[PDB]
């Protein structure tokens, strides 16, 4: 049980925060619990949209929130009717009065969280783990990326003995503090139990 989170490790560089807003002492804890409330619903809802990140900027009673998706449609809605439901369901949580932008994911095949969830799902549907994994690494590796790697937890195939599956291609330097490796974790509830899924994608460097 070693190695740090590849993101948290690189936060100073090659990776910005998910919530970039000043605050302090009396507020910070309140102004943060909120962010989690926010993210809470978005992930509980926008699942089929393909969640990947939830930036949350601030300045004062005019929050940001910039959900990133693979299928920006599912988010918005018909003509923009859903972005009405949510955007409203939002203030029924934070009187704060906040926006709700939506950026599209340029190739969900380079989004560790996505590749992860991608695999997490297949596994839930009962696909061959090792296959799903190799495939995933291929997709990711086959559409850009200077390196990728996926890891599935254990009880592969519902086996009584928890195992751990691999798969990796090209440089994926977890040690190099400047790599720019996207990390993504996906759960996977199952008849037999939870099985975590980890996706690592390497892009450029400097």
């Amino acid at each position: 049980g070693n190695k740090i989170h590849p993101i948290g490790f690189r936060l100073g560089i090659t990776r910005d925060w998910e919530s970039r807003w000043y605050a302090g002492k009396k507020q910070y804890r309140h102004l943060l619990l909120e962010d989690q409330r926010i993210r809470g619903l978005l992930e509980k809802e926008l699942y089929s949209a393909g969640l990947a990140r939830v930036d949350i900027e601030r300045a004062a009673d005019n929050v940001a929130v910039t959900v990133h998706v693979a299928k920006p449609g599912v988010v918005i809605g018909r003509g923009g009717e859903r972005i009405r439901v949510l955007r409203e369901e939002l203030a029924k949580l934070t009187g704060k009065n906040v926006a709700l932008n939506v950026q599209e994911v340029q190739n969900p095949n380079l989004s560790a969280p996505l590749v992860a969830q991608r695999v997490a799902e297949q596994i839930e549907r009962r696909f061959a783990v090792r296959r799903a994994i190799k495939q995933a690494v291929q997709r990711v590796m086959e559409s850009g990326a200077k390196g990728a790697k996926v890891i599935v937890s254990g009880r592969i195939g519902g086996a009584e003995q928890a195992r751990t599956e691999w798969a990796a291609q090209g440089r994926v330097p977890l040690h190099t503090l400047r790599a720019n490796i996207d990390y993504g974790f996906a759960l996977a509830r199952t008849t037999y139990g939870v099985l975590g899924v980890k996706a690592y994608i390497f892009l450029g460097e400097v």
Partner: protein, 98 residues
Amino acid sequence: KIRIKLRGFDHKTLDASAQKIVEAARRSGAQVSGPIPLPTRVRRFTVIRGPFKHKDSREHFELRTHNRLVDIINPNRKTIEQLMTLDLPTGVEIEIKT
């Protein structure tokens, strides 16, 4: 004599921010006292790495807060024009007391 005090988490989101405030008003008031730094206050959070035991795991987390000042003496309407409503950064938050 409008004393501005800028605080931010990013030492760039300020040098950028507080620097705008300098170039702007430098054409409608005095000449600004230049963005003077000011000591940073760091908050350390030393936490045990894993749950249950392992007293010597740890790993350190700090939340450093940075400050900037500036100071514009000789306030002249246009100063409060080039500044009043032309900011940009989001990871910043000001407090001014002329």
